Amino acid sequence: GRDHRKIGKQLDLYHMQEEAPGMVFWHNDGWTIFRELEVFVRSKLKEYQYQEVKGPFMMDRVLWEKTGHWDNYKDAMFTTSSENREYCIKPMNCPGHVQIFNQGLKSYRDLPLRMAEFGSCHRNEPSGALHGLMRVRGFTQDDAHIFCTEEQIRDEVNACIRMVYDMYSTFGFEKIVVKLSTRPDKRIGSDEMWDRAEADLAVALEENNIPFEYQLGEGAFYGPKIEFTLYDCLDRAWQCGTVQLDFSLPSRLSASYVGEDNERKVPVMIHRAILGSMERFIGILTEEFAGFFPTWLAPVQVVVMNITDSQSEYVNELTQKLQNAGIRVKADLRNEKIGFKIREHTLRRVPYMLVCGDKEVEAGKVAVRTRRGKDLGSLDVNDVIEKLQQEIRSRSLQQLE
Amino acid sequence: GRDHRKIGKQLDLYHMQEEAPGMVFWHNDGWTIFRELEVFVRSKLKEYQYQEVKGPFMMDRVLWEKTGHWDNYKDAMFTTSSENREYCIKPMNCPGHVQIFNQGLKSYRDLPLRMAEFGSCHRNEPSGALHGLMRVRGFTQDDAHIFCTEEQIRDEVNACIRMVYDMYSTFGFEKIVVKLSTRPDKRIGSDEMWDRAEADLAVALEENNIPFEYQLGEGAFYGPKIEFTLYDCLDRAWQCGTVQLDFSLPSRLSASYVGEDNERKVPVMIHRAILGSMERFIGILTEEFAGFFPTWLAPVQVVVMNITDSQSEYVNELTQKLQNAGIRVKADLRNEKIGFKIREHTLRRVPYMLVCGDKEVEAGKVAVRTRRGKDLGSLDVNDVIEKLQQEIRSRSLQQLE
Ligand SMILES: C[C@@H](O)[C@H](N)C(=O)N[C@@H](CNC(=O)CCn1cnc2cc(Cl)c(Cl)cc2c1=O)c1cccc(-c2ccc(C(F)(F)F)cc2)c1
Ligand SMILES: C[C@@H](O)[C@H](N)C(=O)N[C@@H](CNC(=O)CCn1cnc2cc(Cl)c(Cl)cc2c1=O)c1cccc(-c2ccc(C(F)(F)F)cc2)c1
Ligand SMILES: [Zn+2]
Ligand SMILES: [Zn+2]
Numbered sequence: 096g097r098d099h100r101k102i103g104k105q106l107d108l109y110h111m112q113e114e115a116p117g118m119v120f121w122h123n124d125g126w127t128i129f130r131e132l133e134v135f136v137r138s139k140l141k142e143y144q145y146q147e148v149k150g151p152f153m154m155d156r157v158l159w160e161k162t163g164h165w166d167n168y169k170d171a172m173f174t175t176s177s178e179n180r181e182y183c184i185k186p187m188n189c190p191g192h193v194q195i196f197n198q199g200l201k202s203y204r205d206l207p208l209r210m211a212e213f214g215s216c217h218r219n220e221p222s223g224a225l226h227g228l229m230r231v232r233g234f235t236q237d238d239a240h241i242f243c244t245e246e247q248i249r250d251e252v253n254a255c256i257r258m259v260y261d262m263y264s265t266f267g268f269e270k271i272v273v274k275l276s277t278r279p280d281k282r283i284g285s286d287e288m289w290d291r292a293e294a295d296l297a298v299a300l301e302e303n304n305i306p307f308e309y310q311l312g313e314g315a316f317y318g319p320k321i322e323f324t325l326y327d328c329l330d331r332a333w334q335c336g337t338v339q340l341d342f343s344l345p346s347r348l349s350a351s352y353v354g355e356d357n358e359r360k361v362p363v364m365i366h367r368a369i370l371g372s373m374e375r376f377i378g379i380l381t382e383e384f385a386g387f388f389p390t391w392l393a394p395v396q397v398v399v400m401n402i403t404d405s406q407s408e409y410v411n412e413l414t415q416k417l418q419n420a421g422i423r424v425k426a427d428l429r430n431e432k433i434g435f436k437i438r439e440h441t442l443r444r445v446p447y448m449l450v451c452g453d454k455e456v457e458a459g460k461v462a463v464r465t466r467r468g469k470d471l472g473s474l475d476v477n478d479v480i481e482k483l484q485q486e487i488r489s490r491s492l493q494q495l496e
Numbered sequence: 497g498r499d500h501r502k503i504g505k506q507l508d509l510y511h512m513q514e515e516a517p518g519m520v521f522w523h524n525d526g527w528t529i530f531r532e533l534e535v536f537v538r539s540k541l542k543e544y545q546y547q548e549v550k551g552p553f554m555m556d557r558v559l560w561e562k563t564g565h566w567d568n569y570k571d572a573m574f575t576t577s578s579e580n581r582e583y584c585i586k587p588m589n590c591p592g593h594v595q596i597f598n599q600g601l602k603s604y605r606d607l608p609l610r611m612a613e614f615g616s617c618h619r620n621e622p623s624g625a626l627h628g629l630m631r632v633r634g635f636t637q638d639d640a641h642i643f644c645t646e647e648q649i650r651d652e653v654n655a656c657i658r659m660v661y662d663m664y665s666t667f668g669f670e671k672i673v674v675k676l677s678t679r680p681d682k683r684i685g686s687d688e689m690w691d692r693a694e695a696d697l698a699v700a701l702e703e704n705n706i707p708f709e710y711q712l713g714e715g716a717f718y719g720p721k722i723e724f725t726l727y728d729c730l731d732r733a734w735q736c737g738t739v740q741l742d743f744s745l746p747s748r749l750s751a752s753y754v755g756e757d758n759e760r761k762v763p764v765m766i767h768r769a770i771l772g773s774m775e776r777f778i779g780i781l782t783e784e785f786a787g788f789f790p791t792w793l794a795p796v797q798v799v800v801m802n803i804t805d806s807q808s809e810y811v812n813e814l815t816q817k818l819q820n821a822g823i824r825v826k827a828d829l830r831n832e833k834i835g836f837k838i839r840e841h842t843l844r845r846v847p848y849m850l851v852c853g854d855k856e857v858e859a860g861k862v863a864v865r866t867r868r869g870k871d872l873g874s875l876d877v878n879d880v881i882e883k884l885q886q887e888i889r890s891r892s893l894q895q896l897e
Contacts, residue, residue, distance in 0.1 A: 110599045114559045116578075118552030120596050126550050149527050151519035151634055152553070152585075152616065153574075158515040173554075173576040175585060177620050182516075184553075184576060184585075195521050198511045215616070217553060219578050233553050 097329065099381035100227040106386055106394070106443060108377075109228070117225040117232030119374055124394035127423070128377055129235075131392050133213060135265065135490065136237045136370070143258050145211040145239055150191030152215065153182040161347050162190050173217050188214035189341075189366060192240040193348040196362075201352040206362065207243035207251050213373070214238040228378030235373040241365040242350070245291070248363055252299035252321070252338055255367045259323050259336045260303070262369045266380060266389075267492050270326040273300060273307035276314040283317055284342055292340050293319050317343030323369075327383045335376065339366040387466065390446040390483070391490040393423065397483065398440045399449045399461075400427040406451040413449065413461060413476060420480050422487065441466050446494060447483065465494050498730075500782035501628050507787055507795070507844065509778075510629070518626040518633030520775055525795035528824070529778055532793050534614060536666065536891065537638050537771070544659050546612040546640055551592030553616065557582040562748050563591055574618050589615035590742075590767060593641040594749040597763075602753040607763060608644035608652050614774070615639040629779030636774040642766035643751070646692065649741065649764055653700040653722070656739045656768050660724055663770050664737075667781060668893050671727035674701060674708040677715040684718060685743050693741050694720050718744035724770075728784050736777065740767035788867065791847045791884070792891045794824070798884065799841045800850040800862070801828040807852040814850065814862060814877060821881045823888065842867050847895055848884065866895050 103109050108125030111118070121129060140147055153175065159165050164172075164187070173184035185191060192210045201208070214236045224230055241251050263271060275296050278289040296319055300307050307321070314320065323336030341364040344350075354360040370376035380388065390396050399414045401407050410426050417424040427436045433450060440448050450462040454473070461479055463471040482495050504510045509526030512519070522530055541548055554576060560566045565588075566573075574585035586592060593611045602609070615637040625631055642652050664672060676697050679690050697720055701708045708722070715721060724737030742765040745751075752760045771777040781793070791797055798818055802811045808829050818825040828837050834851060841849050851863040855874065862880055864872040883896055 107600070110596070112595060114556045114595070115552035115554065115583075118554065119550070120552065120592070120599070121550035122596060122599075123547040123549060126548055129550070130548075146524040147527055147531075148524060149520075149522040149530065151516045151521065152618065153516065153519065153634075155515040173578070173583075175574045175576045177574065178623055182574075191521065194513060194515075195511070195523055198521070198523070199508070215553065222579055 097382045097385050099229075099378040102381050102386040103227070108381070108394075111227075115233075116222045117220055117230065119228065119231065119233065125377075127394040128380075128388065128392055129373060132370070132373060132377065135391075136213070136262075139258060139262055140211045140239075143209070143254060145209040147211045147213075148192065148195055149212060150185065150188055150195070150214065152217075153184050154190065154194075156181040156183055158190060158348075159183045162344060163347065171218050171220075173219050184217045185214070186216050186218050188212045188216065188236065188238045189240055189344055189364070190348060193344065193350050193364075196242055196350055197348070201242075201362075203244065203352060203355045203360075205242075206352060207241050207247050208362075209239060209241050209251075211237075211239040228374045228381075231372070231374055234375070236368050237370045237373060237376075239367050241367070242345070242352075242362040243365065244360075245363055248292070248295040248340065248365070249299055249302075251365055252296055253302050255338045255365065256299055256303045256305060256321070259338075259369050263323075263325055263336075265490055266383070268325040268327070270330075271305075272324040272326075272332070273305055274310045274322045274324070275300070275307055276310040276320045276322065277312060278319065279312050279314050279316065281316060282314070288342065289319070292342070296321055296338070296340070315339060315341075317341045327379065329382075333379050335371040335379075336369045337367065337371070340364075341366060386444045388444065389490065389492050390494065391487045393444070393446050395425055395440075395443070395445050396423045396487065397447045397449055398425050398427050398436070398445050399451065400433065400436045400440075402433050402450065402452040404430075405453060406456050409451050409456045413451065416476065416480060417449075417483075420484055422480075422483055437464060441468065449479070463495065467494070471495055498783045498786040499628075500779040503782050503787040504629075509782070509795075517623045518621060518631065520629065520632065520634065526778070528795045529781075529789065529793055530774060533771075533774060533778065536792075537612075537614075537663075540659060540663060541612045541640075544610070544655055546610040548612050549593070549596055550613060551586070551589055551596065551615070554583040554585050555591065555595075557584055559591055559749075560584045563745060564748065572620050574620050585618045586615070587617055587619050589613050589617065589637060589639045590641055590745055590765070591749060594745065594751050594765075597643055597751055598749070602643075602763075604645065604753060604755050604761075607753060608642050608648050609763075610640060610642050612640040613637075629773075629775045629782075632773065632775055635776070637769050638771040638774060640768050642768065643746070643753075643763040644766065645761075646764055649693070649696040649766070650700055652766055653696055653739055654704070656766065657700055657704050657706065657722075660737045660739075660770050664724075664726055666891055667784070669726040669728075673725040673727075673733070674706050675711050675723045675725070676701065676708050677711040677721050677723070678713065679720070680713060680715050680717055682717055683715075689743065690720070693743070697722050697739070697741070716740065716742075718742045728780060730783070734776070734780055736772040736780075737770045738767065738772070741765075742767060787845045789845060790891065790893050791895065792888045794845065794847050796826055796841075796844065796846050797823050797888065798825040798848045798850055799828050799837075799846050800825060800852065801834070801837050803834060803851070803853045805829075805831075806854065807857050810852050810857045814852065817877065818850075818881060818884070821885055823881075823884055838865060842869075850880070864896070868895065870895075870897075872896055 109119045318340030320339040324334045346361045351359045399410045401410045414426040448464045460473040508523045511521045719741035721740040725733045725735045747762045755761045815827045849865040861874045
């Protein structure tokens with residue numbers, strides 16, 4: 096009903112097996128949703144002027160030791176050896192992004208440098224606590240690291256906040272709770288650096304007219320963060336978005352740029368993820384929509400179906416027209432009752448069933464039925480195709496009227 | 497000089513480092529090429545009616561023992577541990593595809609089932625034998641597995657062959673050498689099975705009029721194979737494409753389907769890759785074109801630039817029009833001589849440089865120069881966008897002549 100594990104099996108989206116705990120086998124229709132979510136995030140990366148990179152799955156333990164994560168999260172990390180050398184399977188993309196930053200001399204002119212990745216990460220999570228798409232070992236982050244000057248933090252965090260609300264609004268999430276985590280007991284740098292760092296986050300939120308609250312002392316060793324919690328239609332809370340300042344990692348991994356005064360400077364790093372885990376976010380959307388994915392996300396967006404054998408060639412032509420228009424379409428030409436076809440494709444949550452009887456063929460029209468069971472009547476083929484295209488392009492939550 | 501390592505560095509496509517031997521860091525412009533190559537393969541996967549899936553990064557050694565690969569190739573696999581269980585970092589995507597197949601009741605009607613994946617694979621290759629993008633440890637296979645009946649092998653091998661030549665021709669590779677490897681001494685199945693299997697591959701090639709040389713006795717124990725070697729402009733051989741029959745793995749991993757007789761039967765598996773390694777193929781393409789990527793592959797397709805500040809608004813408007821047309825375009829309004837700007841974009845292998853002087857603004861035109869140094873003169877903006885769109889959508893090797 097609103098259980099992603101049930102709807103997942105029903106609509107053949109994914110499965111999982113004990114041979115690979117907390118690592119998703121993505122089926123055809125599930126990978127289609129995942130890929131369309133990737134396309135959506137890429138459109139925002141372009142709109143917000145991000146680079147997109149791809150880093151390796153493993154790097155030398157020696158490199159991960161310099162990050163500080165080895166001492167604190169070695170037991171959460173998958174390791175493998177080759178030729179007397181130990182490698183970590185990446186649980187995070189940040190050190191990989193610094194390696195790309197460190198290729199070539201960097202100028203103040205290159206900042207802010209926004210580096211995004213659909214980062215395939217692995218964490219050695221306890222098998223006992225693995226739950227569907229929500230708690231996994233293998234996950235994909237809508238990740239990015241911004242390399243910038245201290246002066247650029249406010250503007251860069253401002254743009255991250257807009258991107259968060261922009262992207263959440265697409266999926267109909269308008270109730271957002273925002274928490275700013277402040278300096279912990281054990282922290283790096285002066286109290287002044289923290290005053291300015293916390294001020295930068297607070298002013299960025301203020302600039303966007305966003306009310307928030309503090310989580311006192313919950314900040315990381317290496318800087319303060321903003322966390323965003325969205326509420327689904329059941330008013331259940333999901334923490335997804337994070338904007339994390341980092342005054343540690345660049346220095347640790349010898350990241351530098353030639354300042355405007357010609358002095359070598361360490362860049363500030365901003366970690367940010369909006370959806371968080373792509374798998375978890377699909378899990379949340381599955382329950383939010385109860386399998387009724389918005390048309391732009393639907394594995395199959397349209398099924399064209401004949402009442403009798405007589406409309407088979409009209410269905411073939413219309414299916415080709417929809418295919419050419421970039422719509423994910425199937426023809427249902429089975430020797431079955433129109434009622435049987437509608438019920439089957441309604442149960443599979445296909446947004447639109449385009450029904451062709453003799454009256455539709457003769458007029459060059461099509462009868463449109465929604466998965467909600469509404470009959471929109473008979474409309475011109477080209478006018479329907481243009482409307483379906485508009486709904487998909489605009490990533491509309493709503494169907495045709 | 498056409499070294500992919502040199503071009504990769506110069507055009508900021510990728511880098512590799514000692515902390516990650518034989519594993520690629522894709523920079524913004526290299527990842528753009530990678531994704532366009534992915535987009536191309538998907539267009540073929542659709543045309544040849546392939547499902548696309550995603551399998552897990554690692555699986556229990558216990559499953560890899562059932563395949564028979566552990567006894568033979570354990571030293572060529574990366575392994576990691578969790579909760580007293582040994583996991584193999586997948587060196588191949590076949591076992592994972594069988595797991596997805598095994599989920600849900602499969603009948604004769606569901607065959608042939610064509611399952612494609614951009615499969616992230618790892619092999620523990622000696623670090624001494626690594627070089628460039630040609631011999632790596634982490635690679636992405638344009639992999640697919642076809643689950644079919646003995647009756648369907650011929651037709652399915654036929655489409656595999658058509659797809660291979662279809663794809664190699666897109667990149668201008670017409671010199672293809674083909675090898676069929678027959679019965680080894682130690683093998684499974686009857687001589688009659690091998691007679692039919694070797695005939696299926698041989699008749700498929702003969703009907704397609706593909707000259708091939710038999711590699712007598714060099715076939716795999718689990719079935720025969722076709723291997724495709726393409727030649728670049730330096731006449732260097734690259735063994736990229738494979739079609740391998742397998743009458744072993746489906747049985748070993750409990751793969752079965754309900755036949756026309758309503759009784760269970762083991763499906764025949766066809767292992768099929770065309771590009772082989774997406775990374776090696778980009779390396780070969782980089783050298784083949786010496787960085788002059790066809791327009792559809794070019795990281796940046798168009799630069800629009802002004803003579804003086806007077807044409808700045810016309811340039812920004814043309815940039816937006818080209819962007820809306822689906823073209824990777826950048827604006828160059830810098831206060832630099834036209835000869836300086838054109839040299840920078842020519843060095844970066846930008847296919848098209850669009851120059852806006854007063855005469856271009858007045859007449860609603862644009863001056864078009866190719867990176868080869870051909871001046872196509874002053875042409876109507878809309879006619880140019882249509883020509884560029886056509887060149888990109890057709891995936892033309894050639895620029896406007
Ligand atoms: C935005 C990115 O650039 C950033 N690098 C990052 O990954 N931030 C963390 C949230 N931050 C932390 O948890 C920091 C503390 N922490 C927590 N766990 C760790 C675990 C490991 Cl193995 C390592 Cl190496 C480091 C850490 C570590 O530093 C984050 C943000 C959003 C989603 C997730 C997430 C990760 C895993 C899951 C899953 F396990 F699948 F359920 C779900 C969600 C994590
Ligand atoms: C088409 C696919 O579905 C098929 N499963 C497959 O992977 N075919 C093999 C060619 N076939 C063989 O190599 C068979 C023999 N062989 C050889 N080496 C192995 C090594 C390991 Cl670790 C394992 Cl588990 C199995 C094998 C194994 O079976 C293939 C085809 C094309 C390219 C590659 C390839 C090989 C090496 C690299 C490398 F450079 F190392 F990164 C990159 C790509 C491999
Ligand atoms: Zn990070
Ligand atoms: Zn295979």
